[PDB]
Amino acid sequence: LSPAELHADSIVIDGLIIAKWNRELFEDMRKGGLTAANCTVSVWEGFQATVNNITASNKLIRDNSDLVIPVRSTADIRKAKEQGKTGILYGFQNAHAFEDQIGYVEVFKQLGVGIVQMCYNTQNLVGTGCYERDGGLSGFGREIVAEMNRVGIMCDLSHVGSKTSEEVILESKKPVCYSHCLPSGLKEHPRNKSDEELKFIADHGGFVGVTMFAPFLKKGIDSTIDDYAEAIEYVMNIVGEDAIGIGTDFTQGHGHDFFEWLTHDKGYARRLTNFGKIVNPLGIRTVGEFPNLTETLLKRGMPERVVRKVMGENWVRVLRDVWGE
Amino acid sequence: LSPAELHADSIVIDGLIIAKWNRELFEDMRKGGLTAANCTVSVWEGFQATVNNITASNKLIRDNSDLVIPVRSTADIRKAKEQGKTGILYGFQNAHAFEDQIGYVEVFKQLGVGIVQMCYNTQNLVGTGCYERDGGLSGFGREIVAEMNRVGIMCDLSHVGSKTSEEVILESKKPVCYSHCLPSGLKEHPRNKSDEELKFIADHGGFVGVTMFAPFLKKGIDSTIDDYAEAIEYVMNIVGEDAIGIGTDFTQGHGHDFFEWLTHDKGYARRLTNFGKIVNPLGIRTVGEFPNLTETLLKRGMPERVVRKVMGENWVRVLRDVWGE
């Protein structure tokens, strides 16, 4: 009932987190009662470099198994909750890790990867990102989507351009998602999505995780926990209460080198953009503050049942759909 | 001079050979009076692997140095004519070997690569090739072209397809070429270029070597060395006598797997096309019959100085310009 007992008695999931990994990050996940999270282990990296991140990841988990456990099935999510731990679901923010092999889709799946973004800002072998002329979904890309549907890896399009994004929604036989994005109806920015877009992905059984990245918020570095709920309500107004969730996009622990890496093509080439100061909305600057989002949305008019949805239940339902598991 | 004396006294150069390497291939090159030839060492492979192709090539050059030598500058071309050997010019048919490192461009030039094709049939990191909806040249591609221009690696667009192709011609500050293509005015086909595309490339200081791959010829597997001259004459009629050359798509020695490799995306995925029965036009079916090409053109009426140009002079000139030497 009380905004604390609810968060506690609930499945909380985060669609996207790219924080510096260490035991302290893990403990802050626990402090926030986080049940599970899509953790990025690749963005610009190729096959082997991505594999390395996974090896490094499996080690941190292994060494901190009293705080976190791997996530391959939604059953792992139920386990994590009933065990007082945080489930970790491996994700890629780029299909580039597959390189030119369609066989790697099954390989990574076998290594615990459950969500893969099609592209990242610029042109891929499969499609093209959101910061450049979008050429659409390539032939090779349609083969990658297909195998991903067969193997059980969800298609993510947060950083993919509109042309290729639409083709992917129309091609996959399993729900796709925008793990972390914001409405352009509040802020123009190249990474935000239009109302037409948000309505189009929901109509096709899609899912949408609303993010809180300062740069993409209407008020930016002056945004508050409430400005986030505002955006979450704007999206739910188009998407509906069954296709909306959370995708904070927490970059907790990272520094200067990390952001410059995210803003230059390939992590080192030409400048694609400039985010500016990185200031999360006041009221939810750290993972350990996740519970303020349950209390907020709650004290904002949204009934308990819908809240359970937005905080995690919805993420579980789609992941269950896509993994058959 | 009789066509025999002429061919022998001429600098004959093949814009593109991609046959099975061994001591028998060389020797046949010598029989043909071949001065220098653009030899492909990459088409579907990435950085390392292409490098392996290169160390294996260097091995052959070294073990058969009485017949061949490396060609890095137009001076190396003259050196071959002086020593009666065939200079080998390492070339790529896909920029995929650069992967996502603009620094690899210089790396390969230092290893001998002097001519590179931007894409091969399908989407790249830099563009798209004929055979699929062409999105154009990307930001990463624009950077690659700029570096290629600086380091001295000529841009090839035979398998690139109009759009990224045209954009490359405008972006590049050095002449670019269609090492091996045929006029679509004689045979409609995705690999063939139009009269507008051929005039365009020439009007921009570009170069065009004509090929004789059966599938692209009007008469197909029924063509003859004359049908080849007809194409050369067709192209020279637009391009002029200074922007045309030879780029016989010699595949001497290769078997069945090789062609299936050339016809499926990434070398194994979806079939992009089907060449059919591979038969070279009668009277020029082996690199050892090169002198018949000179004889023919001459027999058809092309004056001596022009024949010398089509056979090799034009190539050396554009390579001289593009390499700064």
XYZ file of C-alpha atoms in Angstrom:
650
model
C 0.000 0.000 0.000
C 2.470 2.647 1.172
C 4.900 4.015 -1.432
C 7.759 1.803 -0.231
C 5.870 -1.385 0.492
C 4.739 -1.284 -3.136
C 8.206 -0.846 -4.625
C 9.373 -3.558 -2.211
C 6.565 -5.975 -3.055
C 7.184 -5.383 -6.752
C 9.231 -6.516 -9.737
C 11.331 -3.539 -10.752
C 13.230 -3.712 -14.020
C 15.359 -1.217 -15.915
C 15.521 -1.320 -19.688
C 19.011 0.154 -19.885
C 22.074 0.649 -17.723
C 25.681 1.418 -18.781
C 27.345 2.025 -15.430
C 30.971 1.404 -14.466
C 30.891 -2.130 -13.050
C 32.081 -2.827 -9.506
C 30.677 -4.085 -6.211
C 29.483 -0.618 -5.282
C 27.271 -0.452 -8.364
C 25.814 -3.809 -7.383
C 25.043 -2.620 -3.863
C 23.309 0.519 -5.150
C 21.147 -1.748 -7.294
C 20.216 -3.550 -4.106
C 19.589 -0.276 -2.257
C 17.079 0.641 -4.949
C 15.359 -2.735 -4.802
C 16.111 -3.339 -8.483
C 14.999 -6.824 -9.527
C 16.612 -6.995 -12.958
C 18.336 -4.829 -15.550
C 19.415 -4.801 -19.211
C 23.148 -4.197 -18.862
C 25.123 -3.113 -21.898
C 28.289 -5.087 -22.634
C 28.892 -3.681 -26.129
C 28.398 -0.518 -28.203
C 31.194 -0.033 -30.769
C 33.070 -3.324 -30.207
C 33.316 -6.187 -32.690
C 32.929 -9.914 -31.958
C 35.961 -10.837 -29.838
C 36.058 -7.480 -28.044
C 32.402 -8.017 -27.113
C 33.169 -11.562 -25.957
C 35.847 -10.054 -23.716
C 33.339 -7.745 -22.062
C 31.172 -10.780 -21.385
C 34.091 -12.670 -19.849
C 34.848 -9.645 -17.685
C 31.152 -9.401 -16.792
C 30.766 -13.069 -15.839
C 33.695 -12.536 -13.474
C 32.206 -9.598 -11.587
C 28.975 -11.527 -11.168
C 30.830 -14.659 -10.087
C 32.812 -12.712 -7.513
C 29.695 -10.880 -6.270
C 27.141 -13.712 -6.520
C 25.656 -12.641 -3.191
C 24.339 -9.481 -4.870
C 23.614 -10.431 -8.474
C 22.826 -13.424 -10.700
C 22.659 -13.921 -14.505
C 19.380 -13.525 -16.384
C 18.548 -15.711 -19.394
C 14.877 -16.531 -18.768
C 12.102 -14.601 -17.029
C 12.281 -17.415 -14.499
C 15.656 -15.950 -13.511
C 13.787 -12.728 -12.763
C 11.400 -14.459 -10.368
C 14.388 -16.186 -8.798
C 16.305 -12.944 -8.302
C 13.334 -11.327 -6.576
C 12.625 -14.232 -4.231
C 16.314 -14.426 -3.388
C 16.880 -10.778 -2.575
C 19.244 -10.218 -5.486
C 19.509 -8.296 -8.733
C 19.208 -10.140 -11.994
C 21.521 -9.078 -14.792
C 20.456 -9.418 -18.413
C 23.225 -8.919 -20.987
C 22.521 -6.507 -23.809
C 24.203 -5.066 -26.905
C 23.567 -1.542 -28.090
C 24.888 -2.500 -31.514
C 24.459 -5.453 -33.871
C 28.052 -4.847 -34.975
C 29.207 -7.503 -32.490
C 27.733 -10.075 -34.898
C 30.121 -8.708 -37.525
C 29.183 -10.485 -40.787
C 28.248 -13.820 -39.277
C 24.598 -14.764 -38.805
C 25.953 -17.628 -36.734
C 27.004 -15.273 -33.947
C 23.398 -14.477 -33.111
C 23.039 -17.974 -31.665
C 26.531 -17.839 -30.111
C 25.859 -14.732 -28.041
C 22.452 -16.017 -27.057
C 24.279 -19.072 -25.676
C 26.473 -16.641 -23.740
C 23.546 -14.932 -22.045
C 22.741 -12.059 -24.407
C 19.008 -11.389 -24.552
C 18.576 -7.948 -26.093
C 20.348 -6.419 -29.069
C 20.035 -2.947 -30.536
C 20.118 -3.047 -34.343
C 22.402 -0.064 -34.849
C 24.198 2.666 -32.934
C 23.953 6.236 -34.266
C 25.623 5.531 -37.620
C 25.533 3.050 -40.512
C 25.901 -0.657 -39.667
C 26.021 -3.763 -41.837
C 22.330 -4.220 -40.968
C 20.885 -0.709 -40.922
C 21.733 2.870 -40.035
C 21.607 4.880 -36.799
C 19.721 8.019 -35.833
C 22.451 10.621 -36.376
C 22.888 10.237 -40.131
C 20.987 9.855 -43.412
C 19.062 6.598 -42.845
C 19.323 4.126 -45.721
C 16.849 1.608 -44.331
C 17.196 -2.026 -43.296
C 19.802 -3.761 -45.462
C 19.446 -7.225 -46.943
C 21.893 -8.711 -44.434
C 19.876 -6.962 -41.737
C 16.721 -8.877 -42.647
C 18.637 -12.116 -42.187
C 19.858 -10.925 -38.809
C 16.342 -10.010 -37.685
C 15.092 -13.423 -38.777
C 17.763 -15.387 -36.871
C 17.206 -13.187 -33.802
C 13.512 -14.137 -33.900
C 14.428 -17.809 -34.181
C 17.107 -17.768 -31.471
C 15.191 -15.547 -29.068
C 16.970 -12.191 -28.849
C 14.818 -9.085 -28.679
C 15.310 -6.334 -31.266
C 16.047 -2.898 -29.811
C 15.742 0.343 -31.787
C 16.381 3.236 -29.393
C 19.449 4.432 -31.342
C 18.279 3.255 -34.783
C 17.065 5.752 -37.384
C 13.423 5.997 -38.473
C 13.691 4.344 -41.905
C 15.436 1.233 -40.656
C 13.424 1.277 -37.443
C 10.126 0.969 -39.300
C 11.352 -1.884 -41.500
C 12.487 -3.789 -38.419
C 9.083 -3.413 -36.745
C 7.413 -4.722 -39.903
C 9.895 -7.598 -40.321
C 10.151 -9.144 -36.846
C 7.577 -11.745 -35.845
C 8.241 -10.938 -32.209
C 7.728 -7.613 -30.413
C 10.612 -5.152 -30.734
C 11.395 -2.227 -28.453
C 12.839 1.210 -27.818
C 14.491 0.145 -24.547
C 15.351 3.765 -23.786
C 13.979 6.878 -25.491
C 11.975 10.062 -25.052
C 9.119 11.794 -26.930
C 10.146 14.374 -29.518
C 6.783 15.958 -28.761
C 8.541 17.441 -25.740
C 12.087 17.872 -27.111
C 13.097 17.736 -30.793
C 16.492 15.981 -30.532
C 17.576 13.327 -33.115
C 17.181 10.463 -30.625
C 13.645 11.242 -29.470
C 10.637 9.593 -31.117
C 7.614 11.255 -32.765
C 4.036 10.575 -31.673
C 3.429 8.812 -34.979
C 6.450 6.616 -34.252
C 5.409 5.776 -30.708
C 1.917 4.919 -31.922
C 3.267 2.813 -34.771
C 5.447 0.601 -32.568
C 2.702 0.031 -30.017
C 0.133 -0.822 -32.702
C 2.477 -3.549 -33.912
C 2.664 -5.114 -30.457
C 5.831 -3.208 -29.629
C 7.204 -2.034 -26.294
C 8.639 1.296 -25.151
C 10.970 1.978 -22.245
C 11.049 5.681 -21.344
C 14.470 7.099 -20.477
C 15.638 10.084 -18.410
C 18.829 11.221 -20.149
C 19.234 14.950 -19.458
C 20.169 15.969 -23.046
C 16.875 14.561 -24.377
C 14.559 16.087 -21.748
C 12.481 19.204 -22.363
C 14.065 20.964 -19.380
C 17.413 19.173 -19.532
C 19.795 19.606 -16.604
C 17.006 21.463 -14.797
C 14.664 18.484 -14.968
C 13.286 16.823 -11.841
C 11.943 13.391 -10.960
C 8.511 14.831 -11.868
C 9.570 15.922 -15.353
C 10.406 12.264 -15.913
C 6.983 11.044 -14.785
C 5.578 13.708 -17.113
C 7.348 12.148 -20.080
C 6.353 8.664 -18.925
C 2.723 9.752 -18.841
C 2.964 11.453 -22.248
C 4.203 8.188 -23.755
C 1.656 6.052 -21.950
C -0.977 8.357 -23.433
C -0.061 7.043 -26.907
C 1.413 3.602 -26.206
C -1.058 2.401 -23.571
C -0.524 0.796 -20.167
C 0.616 -2.527 -21.590
C 3.491 -1.380 -23.815
C 5.375 1.022 -21.523
C 8.278 0.538 -19.124
C 11.446 2.019 -17.647
C 14.826 2.444 -19.352
C 16.741 4.952 -17.196
C 19.978 4.793 -19.151
C 22.036 5.126 -15.957
C 25.697 5.892 -16.725
C 26.670 5.723 -13.047
C 30.413 5.805 -12.429
C 31.560 6.749 -15.916
C 33.666 9.757 -16.789
C 34.932 12.023 -19.569
C 36.660 9.409 -21.732
C 33.454 7.324 -21.708
C 31.229 10.116 -23.011
C 33.657 11.226 -25.711
C 33.715 7.565 -26.740
C 29.943 7.527 -27.020
C 29.892 10.775 -29.028
C 32.451 10.091 -31.770
C 31.678 7.643 -34.591
C 33.254 4.229 -33.902
C 34.164 5.662 -30.524
C 37.036 7.697 -31.981
C 36.156 9.231 -35.370
C 34.242 12.405 -36.213
C 32.070 14.090 -33.601
C 28.465 12.923 -33.965
C 27.076 15.106 -31.187
C 27.699 16.860 -27.878
C 25.547 15.997 -24.868
C 26.977 18.630 -22.580
C 26.827 18.346 -18.786
C 25.458 15.001 -17.582
C 22.954 15.712 -14.831
C 20.201 13.203 -14.105
C 16.797 14.537 -13.003
C 16.748 15.628 -9.369
C 15.154 12.951 -7.236
C 16.713 10.065 -9.151
C 20.414 10.782 -9.740
C 21.557 7.319 -8.612
C 20.299 3.770 -9.067
C 19.813 3.504 -5.317
C 17.035 6.078 -5.670
C 14.847 3.983 -7.990
C 12.078 3.804 -5.336
C 11.381 7.543 -5.703
C 9.927 6.776 -9.121
C 7.339 4.404 -7.676
C 6.395 6.933 -5.016
C 6.254 9.763 -7.564
C 4.178 8.110 -10.285
C 2.051 6.885 -7.387
C 1.495 10.273 -5.747
C 0.799 11.520 -9.249
C -2.561 9.830 -9.802
C -1.480 6.574 -11.431
C -3.200 3.640 -9.651
C -1.216 0.790 -8.051
C -1.930 -1.740 -10.814
C -0.614 0.496 -13.588
C 2.434 1.338 -11.478
C 3.325 -2.362 -11.105
C 3.191 -2.373 -14.906
C 5.461 0.566 -15.639
C 7.948 -0.464 -12.973
C 8.528 -3.953 -14.340
C 5.609 -6.311 -14.976
C 5.312 -5.035 -18.548
C 8.984 -5.721 -19.280
C 8.566 -9.262 -18.023
C 5.549 -9.953 -20.260
C 7.315 -8.927 -23.483
C 10.570 -10.709 -22.631
C 8.470 -13.786 -21.940
C 6.865 -13.374 -25.346
C 10.155 -12.913 -27.217
C 12.143 -15.677 -25.476
C 9.253 -18.160 -25.526
C 10.934 -18.681 -22.169
C 54.909 -2.402 -86.322
C 53.027 -5.691 -86.606
C 50.482 -6.259 -83.812
C 53.021 -8.686 -82.321
C 55.901 -6.228 -82.230
C 53.471 -3.612 -80.892
C 52.131 -5.650 -77.982
C 55.707 -6.578 -77.026
C 56.913 -2.964 -77.141
C 53.879 -1.843 -75.122
C 53.143 -1.403 -71.430
C 50.146 -3.717 -71.120
C 48.198 -3.499 -67.872
C 45.132 -5.344 -66.617
C 42.833 -3.297 -64.411
C 41.684 -6.403 -62.562
C 42.719 -10.018 -62.204
C 41.382 -12.395 -59.559
C 42.646 -15.851 -60.428
C 44.189 -18.732 -58.476
C 47.814 -17.920 -57.642
C 50.651 -20.329 -58.475
C 53.695 -20.459 -60.737
C 51.483 -21.484 -63.651
C 49.401 -18.283 -63.423
C 52.585 -16.265 -63.612
C 54.340 -17.552 -66.728
C 50.974 -17.306 -68.483
C 51.061 -13.625 -67.529
C 54.559 -13.563 -69.067
C 53.207 -15.333 -72.148
C 50.629 -12.580 -72.481
C 53.307 -9.903 -72.255
C 51.537 -8.531 -69.193
C 53.572 -5.697 -67.706
C 51.551 -5.117 -64.515
C 48.207 -6.235 -63.078
C 45.785 -5.250 -60.321
C 45.444 -8.453 -58.308
C 42.685 -8.836 -55.736
C 43.622 -10.056 -52.257
C 40.330 -9.228 -50.506
C 36.594 -9.318 -51.267
C 34.643 -10.562 -48.230
C 37.318 -10.757 -45.507
C 38.076 -8.183 -42.806
C 41.411 -6.723 -41.623
C 43.345 -9.733 -40.354
C 42.672 -12.408 -42.995
C 43.212 -9.878 -45.741
C 46.627 -9.459 -44.162
C 46.998 -13.241 -44.308
C 46.131 -13.083 -47.984
C 48.893 -10.512 -48.284
C 51.577 -12.500 -46.459
C 50.655 -15.532 -48.604
C 50.882 -13.383 -51.746
C 54.294 -11.975 -50.748
C 55.382 -15.588 -50.284
C 54.497 -16.416 -53.880
C 56.081 -13.244 -55.241
C 59.270 -14.083 -53.357
C 59.337 -17.737 -54.457
C 58.736 -16.741 -58.093
C 60.678 -13.473 -58.233
C 62.166 -14.420 -61.585
C 58.724 -13.878 -63.085
C 57.127 -11.242 -60.889
C 57.828 -8.238 -58.641
C 55.752 -5.916 -56.429
C 54.252 -2.789 -57.929
C 53.993 0.120 -55.493
C 54.716 3.031 -57.845
C 54.441 3.582 -61.604
C 58.230 3.297 -61.490
C 57.841 -0.345 -60.424
C 55.745 -0.748 -63.585
C 58.575 0.402 -65.847
C 61.001 -1.752 -63.849
C 58.998 -4.832 -64.850
C 59.064 -3.963 -68.530
C 62.814 -3.494 -68.250
C 63.326 -6.831 -66.530
C 60.710 -8.665 -68.553
C 58.620 -9.572 -65.508
C 55.047 -8.967 -64.414
C 54.532 -6.460 -61.660
C 51.807 -7.374 -59.186
C 49.681 -4.537 -57.783
C 47.749 -5.549 -54.637
C 44.122 -4.408 -54.722
C 40.957 -4.791 -52.609
C 37.447 -5.243 -53.985
C 35.825 -4.273 -50.703
C 36.634 -1.628 -48.093
C 35.424 -4.128 -45.476
C 39.094 -4.881 -44.813
C 39.402 -1.447 -43.178
C 36.736 -2.619 -40.741
C 36.201 0.469 -38.564
C 39.743 1.817 -38.514
C 40.621 4.796 -40.680
C 44.201 4.048 -39.651
C 44.135 0.758 -41.568
C 44.084 2.671 -44.841
C 47.655 3.817 -44.299
C 48.489 0.414 -42.809
C 47.607 -1.359 -46.062
C 49.305 1.159 -48.329
C 52.473 0.431 -46.349
C 51.855 -3.248 -47.073
C 51.504 -2.626 -50.795
C 47.787 -2.085 -51.444
C 47.359 0.660 -54.025
C 43.786 0.377 -55.324
C 40.598 -0.225 -53.311
C 36.924 -0.760 -54.138
C 34.474 0.934 -51.747
C 31.861 -1.844 -51.488
C 31.219 -5.298 -52.815
C 27.648 -5.955 -53.929
C 25.930 -5.250 -50.579
C 25.902 -2.715 -47.736
C 29.168 -1.694 -46.104
C 30.342 0.539 -43.301
C 31.101 3.102 -46.003
C 28.330 2.490 -48.524
C 26.251 0.077 -50.562
C 27.039 -1.723 -53.793
C 24.981 -2.552 -56.875
C 22.624 -5.491 -56.157
C 20.669 -3.798 -53.329
C 18.815 -0.572 -52.448
C 21.725 1.901 -52.370
C 21.706 4.197 -49.336
C 24.707 6.218 -50.477
C 28.069 7.152 -48.965
C 28.163 7.444 -45.154
C 30.069 9.766 -42.842
C 32.544 6.997 -42.116
C 32.896 6.515 -45.865
C 33.561 10.187 -46.457
C 36.380 9.902 -43.942
C 37.763 6.799 -45.634
C 37.823 8.476 -49.072
C 39.624 11.505 -47.608
C 42.288 9.267 -46.015
C 42.623 7.170 -49.177
C 43.186 10.417 -51.063
C 45.929 11.431 -48.635
C 47.708 8.082 -48.311
C 47.528 7.395 -52.032
C 45.071 4.546 -52.532
C 42.892 4.800 -55.634
C 39.116 4.490 -55.258
C 37.372 1.799 -57.315
C 33.593 1.663 -57.870
C 32.909 -1.252 -60.231
C 30.782 -3.146 -57.676
C 29.500 -0.008 -55.937
C 26.277 0.954 -57.677
C 25.009 4.456 -58.421
C 24.418 6.683 -55.394
C 27.358 6.035 -53.114
C 29.259 5.730 -56.363
C 28.328 9.170 -57.654
C 28.878 10.594 -54.175
C 32.367 9.085 -54.051
C 33.223 10.725 -57.398
C 32.228 14.149 -56.053
C 33.792 13.647 -52.612
C 37.176 12.316 -53.769
C 39.860 14.886 -54.644
C 41.746 12.439 -56.858
C 40.513 10.582 -59.932
C 38.517 7.439 -59.200
C 37.860 4.472 -61.485
C 35.547 1.689 -62.569
C 38.399 -0.817 -62.853
C 36.220 -3.476 -64.502
C 32.752 -2.724 -65.892
C 30.609 -2.911 -69.043
C 28.080 -0.511 -70.684
C 24.455 -1.218 -69.815
C 23.620 0.330 -73.182
C 24.518 -3.078 -74.627
C 23.311 -5.299 -71.791
C 21.011 -4.371 -68.891
C 22.398 -5.687 -65.595
C 22.990 -4.351 -62.061
C 26.792 -4.448 -62.576
C 26.634 -2.494 -65.830
C 26.860 1.299 -65.911
C 24.719 3.650 -68.024
C 25.887 6.219 -70.548
C 25.057 8.944 -68.047
C 27.172 7.238 -65.404
C 30.036 6.687 -67.825
C 30.013 10.276 -69.096
C 29.733 11.489 -65.525
C 32.789 9.636 -64.222
C 34.886 10.846 -67.180
C 33.733 14.496 -66.958
C 35.131 14.359 -63.428
C 38.604 13.102 -64.273
C 37.577 9.526 -63.571
C 38.801 6.408 -65.395
C 37.042 3.338 -66.818
C 38.615 -0.047 -67.542
C 36.370 -2.332 -69.594
C 35.837 -5.944 -68.553
C 34.801 -9.086 -70.386
C 32.885 -11.140 -67.829
C 30.418 -13.312 -69.776
C 27.269 -12.480 -67.731
C 27.600 -8.773 -68.539
C 28.283 -9.049 -72.258
C 25.457 -8.631 -74.759
C 26.283 -11.978 -76.439
C 26.923 -13.710 -73.130
C 28.702 -17.076 -73.289
C 28.560 -16.696 -77.085
C 30.772 -13.596 -77.191
C 34.085 -13.411 -79.047
C 37.133 -11.189 -78.734
C 35.362 -8.933 -81.249
C 32.295 -8.490 -79.032
C 34.815 -7.264 -76.468
C 36.300 -4.679 -78.824
C 32.762 -3.506 -79.554
C 32.261 -2.798 -75.866
C 35.649 -1.063 -75.639
C 34.644 1.045 -78.615
C 31.222 1.730 -77.094
C 32.803 3.033 -73.895
C 35.615 4.938 -75.565
C 32.956 6.751 -77.640
C 31.687 8.391 -74.464
C 34.709 8.439 -72.162
C 37.297 9.577 -74.719
C 40.686 8.049 -75.561
C 42.368 9.180 -72.315
C 39.938 7.850 -69.724
C 39.602 4.238 -70.897
C 41.529 1.064 -70.193
C 41.312 -2.660 -69.615
C 40.074 -4.578 -66.595
C 39.521 -8.127 -67.803
C 37.808 -10.003 -65.007
C 40.229 -12.945 -65.234
C 39.351 -15.785 -62.843
C 41.829 -18.273 -64.313
C 42.160 -21.434 -62.236
C 39.198 -20.902 -59.909
C 36.532 -23.551 -59.387
C 32.912 -23.960 -58.274
C 33.229 -22.897 -54.631
C 34.936 -19.673 -55.675
C 31.913 -18.496 -57.669
C 29.331 -19.474 -55.081
C 31.554 -17.466 -52.723
C 31.290 -14.469 -55.058
C 27.510 -14.787 -55.308
C 26.253 -15.100 -51.717
C 26.270 -12.160 -49.314
C 29.224 -12.064 -46.946
C 30.291 -15.075 -48.996
C 27.751 -17.556 -47.577
C 24.362 -15.941 -46.866
C 21.603 -15.161 -49.384
C 22.242 -15.585 -53.107
C 22.668 -12.122 -54.610
C 22.754 -13.386 -58.192
C 23.675 -16.294 -60.458
C 26.310 -15.872 -63.180
C 25.573 -19.106 -64.997
C 28.179 -20.837 -67.171
C 31.469 -18.961 -66.866
C 33.001 -18.785 -70.348
C 35.397 -16.078 -71.510
C 34.892 -14.645 -75.030
C 36.643 -16.737 -77.701
C 40.137 -15.510 -78.508
C 40.920 -14.178 -75.023
C 40.004 -16.997 -72.625
C 43.365 -17.034 -70.819
C 45.704 -14.296 -69.605
C 48.236 -15.812 -71.999
C 46.198 -14.628 -74.997
C 46.484 -10.917 -74.182
C 48.272 -10.076 -77.460
C 45.079 -10.999 -79.331
C 43.393 -7.990 -77.766
C 46.009 -5.680 -79.230
C 45.819 -7.387 -82.597
C 42.007 -7.044 -82.656
C 41.674 -3.357 -81.723
C 44.324 -2.591 -84.345
C 42.527 -4.759 -86.884
C 39.326 -2.878 -86.135
C 40.921 0.435 -87.007
C 42.126 1.902 -83.728
C 45.349 3.833 -84.520
C 48.624 2.741 -82.854
C 48.885 5.555 -80.288
C 45.339 4.944 -79.031
C 45.771 1.165 -78.892
C 48.836 1.828 -76.759
C 46.635 3.966 -74.514
C 43.822 1.466 -74.092
C 46.334 -1.324 -73.441
C 48.279 0.363 -70.645
C 49.249 4.019 -70.998
C 45.999 5.375 -69.570
C 46.314 3.188 -66.492
C 49.882 4.265 -65.700
C 48.800 7.891 -66.122
C 45.924 7.804 -63.645
C 47.961 5.730 -61.211
C 50.780 8.222 -61.595
C 48.360 11.002 -60.702
C 46.578 9.219 -57.853
C 49.781 8.037 -56.142
C 51.711 11.293 -56.526
C 54.398 9.203 -58.239
